[PDB]
């Protein structure tokens, strides 16, 4: 039958916060999301710091150089 | 109706942005 199909054990791959199969995940869910989405946000902040500097440097080359500012 | 707090929050997000690089 198709009722012979049970889902294999993911206890190896699971997080610690959802291992107890007698426990409602909802209390941990917000923490589990908050952890992963923090990584993403921290990455975006770190790139945003870089991107700002890279762009600003190219913009500054297009601006007035040292030798023109000197003899102005 | 419902996009007023969202568009205000995105209005803030965009605003600080122009402060962000400049």
């Amino acid at each position: 039958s198709h009722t012979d199909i049970k889902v294999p054990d993911f206890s190896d791959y699971r997080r610690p916060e959802v291992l107890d199969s007698t426990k409602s995940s909802k209390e941990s869910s917000e923490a589990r999301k908050g952890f992963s989405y923090l990584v993403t946000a921290t990455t975006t902040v770190g790139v945003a710091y870089a991107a700002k500097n890279v762009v600003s440097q190219f913009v500054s080359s297009m601006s007035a150089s040292a030798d023109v500012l000197a003899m102005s | 109706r419902n996009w007023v707090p969202t568009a205000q929050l995105w209005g803030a997000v965009g605003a600080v942005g122009l402060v962000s690089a400049t």
Partner: protein, 372 residues
């Protein structure tokens, strides 16, 4: 909506294979290199001037006086090398995993290689240092070895009887534009790839197990982009003059040849194959065939297995061909004296022997071992 649908079928829900290693990341990096060279390059050309009177002064003007001009220059100069590292990975991947079986994709590739070689060669002339001038004077003059019209072909290319102001100014025009032809060709490189789908490391049809490009390979190619950026910025910020030659900081002088004359590192294997043969024309044809033999690779294929993953003899000969290329790259860097002449001679024959003779025979034996 007609554009988004192109970008969907290109990058969003293109069915990629599930099991693609980091050797497929180099394609996206080559585009990132091409875009990096274009964006850095544009900003260099905003200050650079292509006259022999001003060319050197302008490059130094960029480094010294243009605000953050140095960081843009060395990102261009080392990015050029990173483009080439990425290329040699991207070409080798296809050699190993049998991706050359997408004939048109591969043959467009072979074009893409040659255009970048021309781009980077002409780019190197631009700053007008000794090695730039003398690199051009050596490498261009090779064409005079052609049977009946080479001597004319060279003077036409130069715009005179030597490398000069006529050559430099057109070399700038050719540099600034050929990258866009490369990008145009590259979109056709991709166009044939979607027709044929993408290959995986096993060399086995992965229609049974596909996954959407986004979000899997988007975040993977992003990860790989940072590693390319890291590798660039390590070179730019800690070792900008490492891969580059010192003599190019000496302003060009046609009345004084530097002693150890050579191309950049990414042509040294081909330079070594040229030096191997003593006859001039033969040296040029071997130099040419060293690159163009890539086009014969899909015809030289013999094994009933597509990928080298399940092919020991081929794997060893492939990894021999890599080592042999690294030998030729080394030899091309060294001067033409003993013992390097004989090492270069053997390495050069070994190169064509691995491709033409051995690796096909290996595949044929590998078949006979498995009852094919």
């Amino acid at each position: 909506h007609p554009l988004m649908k192109i970008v969907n079928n290109a990058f969003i829900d293109l069915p990629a294979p599930s099991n693609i290693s980091s050797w497929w990341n180099f394609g996206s990096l080559l585009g990132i290199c091409l875009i990096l060279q274009i964006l850095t390059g544009l900003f260099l050309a905003m200050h650079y001037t292509s006259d022999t009177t001003t060319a050197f002064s302008s490059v130094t003007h960029i480094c010294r006086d243009v605000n953050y001009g140095w960081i843009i220059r060395y990102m261009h100069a080392n990015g050029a090398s990173m483009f080439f590292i990425c290329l040699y990975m991207h070409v080798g991947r296809g050699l190993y995993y049998g991706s050359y079986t997408f004939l048109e994709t591969w043959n467009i590739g072979v074009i893409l290689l040659l255009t970048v070689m021309a781009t980077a060669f002409m780019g190197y002339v631009l700053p007008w240092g000794q090695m730039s001038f003398w690199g051009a004077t050596v490498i261009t003059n090779l064409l005079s070895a052609i049977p009946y019209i080479g001597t004319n072909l060279v003077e036409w290319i130069w715009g005179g009887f030597s490398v000069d102001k006529a050559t430099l100014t057109r070399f700038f025009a050719f540099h600034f534009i050929l990258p866009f032809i490369i990008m145009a060709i590259a979109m056709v490189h991709l166009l044939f790839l979607h027709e044929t789908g993408s290959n995986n490391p096993t060399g086995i049809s992965s229609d049974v197990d596909k996954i959407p490009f986004h979000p899997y390979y988007t975040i993977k190619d992003i990860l790989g982009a940072l590693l390319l950026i890291l590798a660039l910025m390590l070179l730019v910020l800690f070792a900008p003059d490492l891969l580059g030659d010192p003599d190019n900081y000496t302003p060009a002088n046609p009345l004084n040849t530097p002693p150890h004359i050579k191309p950049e590192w990414y042509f040294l294997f081909a330079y070594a194959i040229l030096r191997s043969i003593p006859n001039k024309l033969g040296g040029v044809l071997a130099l040419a065939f060293s690159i163009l033999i890539l086009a014969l690779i899909p015809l030289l294929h013999t094994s009933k297995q597509r990928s080298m993953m399940f092919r020991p003899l081929s794997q060893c000969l492939f990894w021999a061909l890599v080592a042999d290329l690294l030998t030729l790259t080394w030899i091309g860097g060294q001067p033409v004296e003993h013992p390097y002449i004989t090492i270069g001679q053997l390495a050069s024959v070994l190169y064509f022997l691995l491709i033409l003779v051995l690796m096909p025979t290996a595949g044929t034996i590998e078949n006979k071992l498995l009852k094919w």
